[PDB]
Amino acid sequence: HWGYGKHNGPEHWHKDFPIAKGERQSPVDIDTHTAKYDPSLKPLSVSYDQATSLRILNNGHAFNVEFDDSQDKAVLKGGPLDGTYRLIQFHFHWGSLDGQGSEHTVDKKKYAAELHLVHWNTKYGDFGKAVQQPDGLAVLGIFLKVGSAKPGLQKVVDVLDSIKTKGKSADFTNFDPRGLLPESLDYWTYPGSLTTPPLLECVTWIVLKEPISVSSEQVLKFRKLNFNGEGEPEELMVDNWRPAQPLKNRQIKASFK
Ligand SMILES: Cc1ccccc1S(=O)(=O)NC(=O)Nc1ccc(S(N)(=O)=O)nc1
Numbered sequence: 623h624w625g626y627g628k629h630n631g632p633e634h635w636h637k638d639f640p641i642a643k644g645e646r647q648s649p650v651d652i653d654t655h656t657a658k659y660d661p662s663l664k665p666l667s668v669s670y671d672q673a674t675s676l677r678i679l680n681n682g683h684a685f686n687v688e689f690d691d692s693q694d695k696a697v698l699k700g701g702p703l704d705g706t707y708r709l710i711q712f713h714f715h716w717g718s719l720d721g722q723g724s725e726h727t728v729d730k731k732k733y734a735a736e737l738h739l740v741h742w743n744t745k746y747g748d749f750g751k752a753v754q755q756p757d758g759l760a761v762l763g764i765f766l767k768v769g770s771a772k773p774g775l776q777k778v779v780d781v782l783d784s785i786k787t788k789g790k791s792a793d794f795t796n797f798d799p800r801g802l803l804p805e806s807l808d809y810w811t812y813p814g815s816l817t818t819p820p821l822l823e824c825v826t827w828i829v830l831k832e833p834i835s836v837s838s839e840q841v842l843k844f845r846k847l848n849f850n851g852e853g854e855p856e857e858l859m860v861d862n863w864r865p866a867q868p869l870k871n872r873q874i875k876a877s878f879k
């Protein structure tokens with residue numbers, strides 16, 4: 623039932639998912655002047671050398687690039703995290719226009735899109751169990767701005783025509799997520815939630831300060847995807863972002879001065 627339209631969008635989600643008005647919902651605005659530098663935060667450890675991508679799926683609200691998460695092949699460690707978090711999938715949120723699309727904002731600034739690399743804590747055995755824990759997930763959030771092309775993104779862009787509509791998937795092996803990372807791993811971190819239903823409060827958010835640049839042509843191809851299934855009326859997959867939620871009793875920490 624839920625989606626991003628006028629009648630099923632973020633402002634309606636609380637009726638099926640009351641945690642939508644919870645105490646640690648995501649995304650949030652990152653007020654850069656109020657975020658506190660935490661010198662005890664460690665460098666982030668992004669170890670994607672052994673990543674095994676498998677498939678790309680249009681799920682009706684975004685597209686997921688899925689990875690083999692049955693071994694420690696692509697893991698996130700360090701930073702605010704205790705233990706080891708395995709990469710399971712990544713996806714993006716984006717706008718109908720370059721001036722919006724990101725979920726997190728920075729001093730109220732909206733980026734054209736936001737990449738989420740979703741990882742689960744191996745102490746909980748699988749993703750389904752992890753989402754039931756307050757430290758179950760670590761999502762690495764990376765802002766996209768429109769400028770120069772991101773070469774490492776192009777393989778993703780070029781397969782999208784084969785998964786235009788909801789429920790379509792395509793083989794997507796040997797994709798290297800390292801090609802989507804910015805130079806710096808400076809980050810902000812805070813406790814939050816899944817940003818789509820079921821909106822579970824299981825995420826340590828790690829949002830990188832440095833955006834990546836993608837080309838206008840690259841984001842335009844995102845906007846050619848469909849929310850609908852094949853044979854249903856075409857509704858472009860755009861503006862699949864949840865707006866900033868109240869920070870409430872939370873402090874955003876920065877890894878950098
Ligand atoms: C629930 C859940 C639990 C177990 C297995 C699958 C699923 S799910 O696929 O139905 N839902 C999600 O994975 N939700 C999800 C994932 C990531 C994000 S986020 N915060 O990166 O945008 N939001 C929601």
Ligand SMILES: [Zn+2]
Pocket residue numbers: 713714715738817
């Ligand atoms: Zn997301």
